[PDB]
Design a binder for this molecule. Sequence first.
Ligand SMILES: OC[C@H]1O[C@@H](O)[C@H](O)[C@@H](O)[C@H]1O
Length: 392
Amino acid sequence: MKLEIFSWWAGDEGPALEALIRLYKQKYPGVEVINATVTGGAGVNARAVLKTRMLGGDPPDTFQVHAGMELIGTWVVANRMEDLSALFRQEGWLQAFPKGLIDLISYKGGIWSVPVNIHRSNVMWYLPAKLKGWGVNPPRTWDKFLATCQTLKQKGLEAPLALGENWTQQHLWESVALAVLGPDDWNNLWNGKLKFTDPKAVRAWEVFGRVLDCANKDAAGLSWQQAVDRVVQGKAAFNIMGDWAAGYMTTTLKLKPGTDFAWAPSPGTQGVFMMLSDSFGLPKGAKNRQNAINWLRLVGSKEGQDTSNPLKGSIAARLDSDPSKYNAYGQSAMRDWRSNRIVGSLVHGAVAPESFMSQFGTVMEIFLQTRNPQAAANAAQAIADQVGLGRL
Ligand SMILES: OC[C@H]1O[C@@H](O)[C@H](O)[C@@H](O)[C@H]1O
């Protein structure tokens, strides 16, 4: 009796998963659980290893996958996943999750994964006591961000913005783009109604370049956790990162939400929640099909989600989630999830297929070397044209 769970929740990302696995083993003492993590932030490495496994005809029993175009445009369109519609009926999940989330996991009459959480992409992290020590406020717009960072440089803080490796630069970019475009024109990139070469979308790169000039110059070789660490250390004032950062700071670093660290929407994005969702499905050919199905039933349940998510920094995907199980951050995110305008993340798989996502890092490289907004815009448009962005 075995179950092989594939994810990128290695190292200090693992507590939430490990808690779920312990729950699973209580319920199913027969099963030996193989925790098959591929180490690498945002699944860049996991994507590559999964590709080798799937094309080699050696699927894991289940794998971490983002709800939306990431899921649909890769293993679903390739006819490598089982339709979970019957399981959804069995478990009452069509009423348990918000309709918009069901839509992201649904395609051509099937339902293809089970959401375990909701993460938010557009969060700015800072330390209220450090900000007071520097005599500044948290910025609510990109203009105020840039002005505050200049003030901070004058006060001796060389790199007021913490930043890491390539994907985290893309991560920062999607917050900047959302602020510059607003939610409607953000959405219009992904349905092809707004071109990347439109002046409105070229401006995202202009603002992004200015913001980049506030960042640590060693960013390229740092993990997302190391970039958060710079803020905790006061070697930076701000970091733009998903709320897995809240999980890190509380679960791993034991910081108190609200006093030892704080949060706001990314500048210019207040009232908009840029979401992503980690989900698990059922690959065809799974060696341990029933054990995988029982894992899906667990990760889709209130018991599972309210055990794991408080550790993770995400909120539950289930509508019936108990807010008393969440700290001050989780409760704040829960409120915003219900009240805000929702849009999807690019970097975390909601809005664009992997064909585009995987090439966007190249676009980002060419912005870092040229610092030319038009070149970056033109590059993103060329990729969009090559992959037929909007066709799925
Ligand atoms: O690695 C950092 C993060 O990457 C996201 O793509 C993922 O959805 C999160 O669960 C977390 O793992």
